[PDB]
Coordinates of N, CA and C in Angstrom, one line a residue:
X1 N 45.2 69.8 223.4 CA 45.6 68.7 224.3 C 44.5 67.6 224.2
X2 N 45.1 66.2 224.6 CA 43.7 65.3 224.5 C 42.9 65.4 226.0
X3 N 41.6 66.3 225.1 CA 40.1 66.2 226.2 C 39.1 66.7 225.1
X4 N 39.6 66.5 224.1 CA 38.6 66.4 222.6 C 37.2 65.3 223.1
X5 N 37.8 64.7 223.7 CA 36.7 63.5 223.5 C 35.6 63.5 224.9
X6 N 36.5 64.3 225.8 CA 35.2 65.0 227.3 C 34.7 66.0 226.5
X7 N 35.6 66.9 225.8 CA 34.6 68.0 225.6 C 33.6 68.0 224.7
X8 N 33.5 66.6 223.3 CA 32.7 66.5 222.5 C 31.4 66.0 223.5
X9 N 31.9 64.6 224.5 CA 31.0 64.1 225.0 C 30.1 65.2 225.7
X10 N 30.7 65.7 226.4 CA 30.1 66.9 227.6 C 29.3 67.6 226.5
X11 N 29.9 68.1 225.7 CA 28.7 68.9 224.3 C 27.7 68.1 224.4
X12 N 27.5 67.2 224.0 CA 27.0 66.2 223.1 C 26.1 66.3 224.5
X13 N 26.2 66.3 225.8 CA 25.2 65.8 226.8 C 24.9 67.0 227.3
X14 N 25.6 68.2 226.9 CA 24.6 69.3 227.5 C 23.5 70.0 226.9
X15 N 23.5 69.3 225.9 CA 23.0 70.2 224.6 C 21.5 69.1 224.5
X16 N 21.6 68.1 225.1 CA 20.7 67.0 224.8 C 19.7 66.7 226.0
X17 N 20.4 66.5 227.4 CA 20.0 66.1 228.2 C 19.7 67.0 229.2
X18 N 20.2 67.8 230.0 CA 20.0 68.3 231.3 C 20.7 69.9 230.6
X19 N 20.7 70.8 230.1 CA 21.4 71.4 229.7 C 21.6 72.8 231.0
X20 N 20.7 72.7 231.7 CA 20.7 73.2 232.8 C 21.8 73.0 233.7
X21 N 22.4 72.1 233.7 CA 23.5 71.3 234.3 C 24.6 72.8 234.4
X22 N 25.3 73.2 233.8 CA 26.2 74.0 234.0 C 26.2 75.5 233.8
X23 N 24.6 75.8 233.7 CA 24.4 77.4 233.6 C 23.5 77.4 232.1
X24 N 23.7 76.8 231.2 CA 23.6 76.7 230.0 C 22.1 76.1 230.0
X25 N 21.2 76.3 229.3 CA 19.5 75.8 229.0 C 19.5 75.9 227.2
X26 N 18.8 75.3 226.9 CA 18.4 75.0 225.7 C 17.1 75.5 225.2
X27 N 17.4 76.1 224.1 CA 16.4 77.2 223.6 C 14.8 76.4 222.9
X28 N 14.1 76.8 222.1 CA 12.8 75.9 221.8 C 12.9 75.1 220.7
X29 N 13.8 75.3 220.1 CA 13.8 74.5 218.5 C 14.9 73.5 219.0
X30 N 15.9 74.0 220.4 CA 16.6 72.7 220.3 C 18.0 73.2 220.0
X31 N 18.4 74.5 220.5 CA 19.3 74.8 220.5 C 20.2 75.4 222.0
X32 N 21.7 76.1 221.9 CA 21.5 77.2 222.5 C 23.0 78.1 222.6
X33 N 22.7 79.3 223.4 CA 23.5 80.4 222.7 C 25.3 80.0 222.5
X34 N 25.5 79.6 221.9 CA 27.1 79.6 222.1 C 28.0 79.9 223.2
X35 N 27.4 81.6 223.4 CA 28.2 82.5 223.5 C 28.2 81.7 225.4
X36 N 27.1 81.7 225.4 CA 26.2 81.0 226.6 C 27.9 79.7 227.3
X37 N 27.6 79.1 226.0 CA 28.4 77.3 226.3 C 30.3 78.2 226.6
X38 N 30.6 79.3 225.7 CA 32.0 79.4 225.3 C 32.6 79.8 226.8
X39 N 32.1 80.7 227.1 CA 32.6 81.6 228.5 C 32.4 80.9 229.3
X40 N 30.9 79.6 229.8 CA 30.5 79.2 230.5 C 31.9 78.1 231.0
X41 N 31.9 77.2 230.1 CA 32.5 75.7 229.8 C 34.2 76.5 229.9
X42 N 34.2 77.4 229.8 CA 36.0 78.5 229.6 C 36.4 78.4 231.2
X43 N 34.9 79.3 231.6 CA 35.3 79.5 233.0 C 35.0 78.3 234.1
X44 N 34.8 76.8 233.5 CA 34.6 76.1 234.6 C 35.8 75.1 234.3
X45 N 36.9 76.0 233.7 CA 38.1 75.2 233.8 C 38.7 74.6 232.4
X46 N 37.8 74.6 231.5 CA 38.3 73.8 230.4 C 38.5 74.5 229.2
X47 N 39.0 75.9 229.8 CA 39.5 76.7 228.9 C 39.0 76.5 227.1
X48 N 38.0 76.7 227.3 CA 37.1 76.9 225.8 C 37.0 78.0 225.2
X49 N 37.9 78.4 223.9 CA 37.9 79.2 223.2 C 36.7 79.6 222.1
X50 N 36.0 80.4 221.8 CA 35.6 79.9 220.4 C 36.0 79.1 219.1
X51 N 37.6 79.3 219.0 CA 38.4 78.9 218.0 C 38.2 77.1 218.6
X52 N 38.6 77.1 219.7 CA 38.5 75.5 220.1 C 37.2 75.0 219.9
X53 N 35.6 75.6 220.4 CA 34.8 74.8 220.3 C 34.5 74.4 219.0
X54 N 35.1 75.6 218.2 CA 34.5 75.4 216.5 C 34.8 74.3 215.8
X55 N 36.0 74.2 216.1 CA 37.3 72.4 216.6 C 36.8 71.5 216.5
X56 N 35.6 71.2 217.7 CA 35.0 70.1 218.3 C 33.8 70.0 217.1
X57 N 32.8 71.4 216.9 CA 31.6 71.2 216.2 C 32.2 70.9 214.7
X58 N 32.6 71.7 214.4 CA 33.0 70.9 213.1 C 34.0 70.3 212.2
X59 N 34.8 70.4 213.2 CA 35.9 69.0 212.8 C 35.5 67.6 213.2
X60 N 35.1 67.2 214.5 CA 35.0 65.9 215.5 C 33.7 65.9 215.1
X61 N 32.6 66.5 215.5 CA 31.1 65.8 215.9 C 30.2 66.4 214.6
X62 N 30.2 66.8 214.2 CA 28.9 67.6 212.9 C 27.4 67.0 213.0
X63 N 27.5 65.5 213.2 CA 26.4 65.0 213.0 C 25.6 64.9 214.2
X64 N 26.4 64.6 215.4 CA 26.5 64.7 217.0 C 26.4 65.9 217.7
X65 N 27.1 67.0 217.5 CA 26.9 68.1 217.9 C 27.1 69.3 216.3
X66 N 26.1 70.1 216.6 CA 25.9 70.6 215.5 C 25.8 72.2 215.7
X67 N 25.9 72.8 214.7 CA 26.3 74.2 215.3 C 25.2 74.9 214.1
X68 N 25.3 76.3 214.3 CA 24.7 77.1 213.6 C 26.1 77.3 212.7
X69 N 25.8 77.7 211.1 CA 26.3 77.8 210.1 C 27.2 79.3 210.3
X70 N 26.5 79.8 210.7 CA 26.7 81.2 211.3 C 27.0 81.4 212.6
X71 N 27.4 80.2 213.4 CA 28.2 79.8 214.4 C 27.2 80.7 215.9
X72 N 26.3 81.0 215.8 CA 25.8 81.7 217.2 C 25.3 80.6 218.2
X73 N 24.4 79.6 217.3 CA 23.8 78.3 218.3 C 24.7 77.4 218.4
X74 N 24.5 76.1 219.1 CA 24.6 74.9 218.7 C 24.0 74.0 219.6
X75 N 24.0 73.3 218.8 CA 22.9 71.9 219.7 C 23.9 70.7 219.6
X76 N 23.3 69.5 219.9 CA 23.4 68.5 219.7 C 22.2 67.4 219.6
X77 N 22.2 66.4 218.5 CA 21.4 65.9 218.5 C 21.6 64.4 219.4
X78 N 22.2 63.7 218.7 CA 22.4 62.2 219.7 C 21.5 61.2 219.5
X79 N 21.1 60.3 220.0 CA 20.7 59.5 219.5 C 21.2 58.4 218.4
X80 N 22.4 58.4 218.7 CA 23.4 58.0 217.1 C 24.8 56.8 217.7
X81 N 24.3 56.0 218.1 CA 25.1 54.5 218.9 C 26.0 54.3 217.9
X82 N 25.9 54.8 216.1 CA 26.9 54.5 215.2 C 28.1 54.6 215.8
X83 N 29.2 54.5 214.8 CA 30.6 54.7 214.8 C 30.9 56.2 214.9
X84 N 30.7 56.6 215.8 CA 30.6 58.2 215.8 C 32.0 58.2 215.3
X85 N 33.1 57.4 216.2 CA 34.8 57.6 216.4 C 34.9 58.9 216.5
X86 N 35.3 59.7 218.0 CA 35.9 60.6 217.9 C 37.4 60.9 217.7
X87 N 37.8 60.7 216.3 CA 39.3 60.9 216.4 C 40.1 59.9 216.5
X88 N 39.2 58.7 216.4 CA 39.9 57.4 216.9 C 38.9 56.3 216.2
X89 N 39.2 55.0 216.7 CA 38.2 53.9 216.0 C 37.7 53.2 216.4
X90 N 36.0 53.3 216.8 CA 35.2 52.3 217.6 C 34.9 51.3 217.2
X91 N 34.6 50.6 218.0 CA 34.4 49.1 217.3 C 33.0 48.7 218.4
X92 N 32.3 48.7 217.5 CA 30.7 48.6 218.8 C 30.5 47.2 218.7
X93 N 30.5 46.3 219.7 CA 30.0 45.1 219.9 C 27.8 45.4 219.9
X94 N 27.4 44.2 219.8 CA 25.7 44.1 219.3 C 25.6 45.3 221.1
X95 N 25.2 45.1 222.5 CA 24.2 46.0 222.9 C 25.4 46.5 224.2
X96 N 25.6 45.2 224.7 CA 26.7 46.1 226.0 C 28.3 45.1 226.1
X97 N 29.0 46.2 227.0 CA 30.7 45.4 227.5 C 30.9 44.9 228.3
X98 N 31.0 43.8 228.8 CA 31.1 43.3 230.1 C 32.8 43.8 230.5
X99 N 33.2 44.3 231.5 CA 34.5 44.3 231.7 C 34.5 43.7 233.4
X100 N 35.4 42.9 233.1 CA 35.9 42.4 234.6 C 37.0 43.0 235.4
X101 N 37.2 43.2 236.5 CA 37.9 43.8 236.8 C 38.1 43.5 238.8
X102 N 38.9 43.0 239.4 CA 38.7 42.7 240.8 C 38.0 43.4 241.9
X103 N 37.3 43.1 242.6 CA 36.1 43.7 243.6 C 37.0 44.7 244.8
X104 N 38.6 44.3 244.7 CA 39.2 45.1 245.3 C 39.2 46.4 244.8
X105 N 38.7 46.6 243.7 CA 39.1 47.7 242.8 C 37.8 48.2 243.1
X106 N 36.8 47.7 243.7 CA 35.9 48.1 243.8 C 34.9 49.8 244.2
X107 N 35.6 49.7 245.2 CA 35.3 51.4 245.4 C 36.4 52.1 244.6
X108 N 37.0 52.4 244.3 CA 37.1 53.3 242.8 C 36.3 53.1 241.9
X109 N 36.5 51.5 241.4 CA 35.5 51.9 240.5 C 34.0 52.5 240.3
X110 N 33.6 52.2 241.5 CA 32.3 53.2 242.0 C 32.4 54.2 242.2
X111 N 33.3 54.9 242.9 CA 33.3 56.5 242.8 C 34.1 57.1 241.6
X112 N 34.9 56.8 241.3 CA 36.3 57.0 240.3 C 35.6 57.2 238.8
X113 N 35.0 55.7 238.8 CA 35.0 54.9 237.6 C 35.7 53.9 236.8
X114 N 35.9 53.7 235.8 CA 37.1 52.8 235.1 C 37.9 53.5 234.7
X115 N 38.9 53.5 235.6 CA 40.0 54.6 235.0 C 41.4 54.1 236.1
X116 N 42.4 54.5 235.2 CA 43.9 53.8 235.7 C 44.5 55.3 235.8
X117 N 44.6 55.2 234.5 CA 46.1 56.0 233.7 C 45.4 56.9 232.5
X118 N 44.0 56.9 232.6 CA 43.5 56.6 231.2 C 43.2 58.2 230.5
X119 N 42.5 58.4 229.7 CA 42.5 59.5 228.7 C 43.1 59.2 227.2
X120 N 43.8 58.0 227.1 CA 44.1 57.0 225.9 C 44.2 55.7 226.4
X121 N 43.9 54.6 226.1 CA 43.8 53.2 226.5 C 44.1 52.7 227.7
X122 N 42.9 52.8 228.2 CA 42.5 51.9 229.8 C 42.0 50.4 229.0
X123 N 41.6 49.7 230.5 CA 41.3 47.8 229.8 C 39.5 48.0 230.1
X124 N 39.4 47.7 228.8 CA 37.8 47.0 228.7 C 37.9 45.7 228.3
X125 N 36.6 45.0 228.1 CA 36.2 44.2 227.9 C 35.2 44.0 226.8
X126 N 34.6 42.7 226.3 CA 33.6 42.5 225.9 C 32.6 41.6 226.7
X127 N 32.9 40.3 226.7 CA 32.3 39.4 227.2 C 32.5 39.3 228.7
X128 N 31.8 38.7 229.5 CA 32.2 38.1 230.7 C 33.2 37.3 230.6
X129 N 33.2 36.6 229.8 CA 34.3 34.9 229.4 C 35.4 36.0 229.5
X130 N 35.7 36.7 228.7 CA 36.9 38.1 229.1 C 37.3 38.5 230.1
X131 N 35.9 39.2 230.8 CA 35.5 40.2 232.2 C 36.7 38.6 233.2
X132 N 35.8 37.8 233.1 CA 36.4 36.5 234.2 C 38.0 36.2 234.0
X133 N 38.0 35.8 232.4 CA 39.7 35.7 232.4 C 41.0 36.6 232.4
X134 N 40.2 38.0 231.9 CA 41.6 38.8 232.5 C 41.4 39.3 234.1
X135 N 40.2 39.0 234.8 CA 40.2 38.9 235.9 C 40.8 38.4 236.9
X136 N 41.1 37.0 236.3 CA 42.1 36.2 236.9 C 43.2 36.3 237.3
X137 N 43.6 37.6 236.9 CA 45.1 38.1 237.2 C 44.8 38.7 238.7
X138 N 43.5 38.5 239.6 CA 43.5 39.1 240.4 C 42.5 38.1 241.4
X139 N 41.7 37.6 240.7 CA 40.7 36.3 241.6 C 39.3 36.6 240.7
X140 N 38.6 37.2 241.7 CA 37.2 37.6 241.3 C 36.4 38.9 240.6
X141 N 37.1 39.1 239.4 CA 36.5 40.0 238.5 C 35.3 40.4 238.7
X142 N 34.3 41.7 239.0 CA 33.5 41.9 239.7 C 32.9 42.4 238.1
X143 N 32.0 42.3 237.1 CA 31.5 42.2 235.9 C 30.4 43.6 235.7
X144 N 31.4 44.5 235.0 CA 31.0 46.1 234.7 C 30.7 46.0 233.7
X145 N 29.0 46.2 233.3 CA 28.4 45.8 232.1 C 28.3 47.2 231.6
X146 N 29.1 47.9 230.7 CA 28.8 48.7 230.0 C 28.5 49.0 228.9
X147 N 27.5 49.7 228.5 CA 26.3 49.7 227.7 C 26.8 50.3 226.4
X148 N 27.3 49.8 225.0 CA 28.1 50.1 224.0 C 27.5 50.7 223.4
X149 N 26.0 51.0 223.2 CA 25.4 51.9 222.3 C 25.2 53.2 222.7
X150 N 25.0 53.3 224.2 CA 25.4 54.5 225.3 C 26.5 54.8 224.9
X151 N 27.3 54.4 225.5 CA 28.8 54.9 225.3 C 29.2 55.4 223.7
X152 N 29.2 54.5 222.8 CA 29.1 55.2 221.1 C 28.3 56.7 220.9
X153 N 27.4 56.6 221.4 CA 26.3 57.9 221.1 C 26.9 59.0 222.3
X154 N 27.3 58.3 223.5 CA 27.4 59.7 224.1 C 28.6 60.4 224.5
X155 N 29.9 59.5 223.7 CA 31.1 60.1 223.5 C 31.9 59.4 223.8
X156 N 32.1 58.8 223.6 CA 32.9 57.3 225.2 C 33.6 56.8 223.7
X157 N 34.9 56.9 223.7 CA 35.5 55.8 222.8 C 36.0 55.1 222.8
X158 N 36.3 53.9 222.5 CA 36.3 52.5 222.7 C 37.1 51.9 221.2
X159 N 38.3 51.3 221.8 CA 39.2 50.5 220.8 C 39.1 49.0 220.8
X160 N 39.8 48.8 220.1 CA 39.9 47.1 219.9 C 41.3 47.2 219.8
X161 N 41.7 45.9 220.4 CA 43.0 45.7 220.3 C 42.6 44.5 219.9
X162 N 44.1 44.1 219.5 CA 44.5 43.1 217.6 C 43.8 41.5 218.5
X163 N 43.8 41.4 220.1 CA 43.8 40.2 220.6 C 42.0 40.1 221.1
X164 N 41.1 41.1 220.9 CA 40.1 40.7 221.2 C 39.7 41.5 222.3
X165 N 40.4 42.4 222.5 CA 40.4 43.5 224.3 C 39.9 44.4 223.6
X166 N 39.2 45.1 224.5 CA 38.9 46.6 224.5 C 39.5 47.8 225.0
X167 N 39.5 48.6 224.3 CA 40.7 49.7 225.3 C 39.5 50.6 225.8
X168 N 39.3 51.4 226.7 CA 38.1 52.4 226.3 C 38.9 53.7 227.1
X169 N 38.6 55.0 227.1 CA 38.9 56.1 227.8 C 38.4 56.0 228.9
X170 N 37.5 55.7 229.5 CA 37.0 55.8 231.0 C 35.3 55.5 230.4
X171 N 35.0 55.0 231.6 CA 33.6 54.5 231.4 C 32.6 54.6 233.1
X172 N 31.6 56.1 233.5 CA 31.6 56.3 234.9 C 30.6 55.0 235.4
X173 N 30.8 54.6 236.6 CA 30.3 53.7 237.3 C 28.9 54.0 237.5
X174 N 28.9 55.5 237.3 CA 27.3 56.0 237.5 C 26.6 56.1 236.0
X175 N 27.6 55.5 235.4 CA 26.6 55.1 233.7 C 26.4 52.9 234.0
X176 N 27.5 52.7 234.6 CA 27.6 51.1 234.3 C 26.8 50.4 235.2
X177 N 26.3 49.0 234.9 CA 25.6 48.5 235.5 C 26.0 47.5 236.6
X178 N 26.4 47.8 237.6 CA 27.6 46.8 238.5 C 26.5 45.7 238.8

């Protein structure tokens, strides 16, 4: 089902950042037990197989989340703002996104985040000049700067449409810069 791209992200940040976060810690070289992430990440709802995570490490992420050869570890590295594209096709603008979007929207988008319908193409932006004019459709577009080389590197995928728009999967308010 599509959650390829929460579950590469979520790899990709537990393995990196706080790995403590869900039971799971990271071992000294920078790894940690699989077996740890499979049952853990299974039983907090997102039904993770071994056959499935093996999916994510080495179909989707290799470079981004990386596994033991012999499949017991895996880590993730990160640091990698490239075109990761999980599965899809990013298009990174130079550092961040401005998306506009009305101040009525405002508490979701603070608690919620940027999210409609989304898990395939919600509305981003690039510029403010954007953020402001598809704003318009509502008054005062309230200008959600989100950070493109964060989002590329930490799993966030992000399209372009043929007119200059961004499509993105969701982008949390507790990553964006309101």
């Amino acid at each position: 089902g599509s959650h390829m791209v929460k579950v590469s992200k979520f790899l990709s940040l537990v393995l990196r950042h706080n790995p403590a976060l869900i039971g799971l810690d990271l071992d000294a070289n920078g790894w940690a037990p699989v077996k740890e992430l499979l049952a853990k990440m299974k039983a907090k709802g997102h039904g993770i197989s071994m056959e499935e995570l093996k999916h994510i490490v080495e179909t989707n992420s290799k470079k981004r989340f990386a596994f033991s050869e012999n499949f017991e570890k895996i880590r993730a590295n990160q640091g990698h703002s490239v075109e990761v594209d999980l599965g899809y096709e990013k298009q990174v603008p130079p550092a961040v996104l401005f998306h506009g979007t009305a101040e009525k929207n405002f508490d979701l988008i603070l608690k919620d985040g940027i999210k409609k319908m989304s898990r395939h193409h919600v509305h981003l932006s690039q510029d403010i000049t954007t953020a402001r004019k598809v704003g318009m459709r509502h008054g005062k577009p309230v200008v959600l700067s989100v950070d493109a080389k964060g989002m590329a590197d930490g799993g966030f995928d992000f399209y372009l449409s043929n007119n200059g728009v961004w499509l993105i999967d969701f982008v949390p308010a507790e990553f964006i810069k309101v």
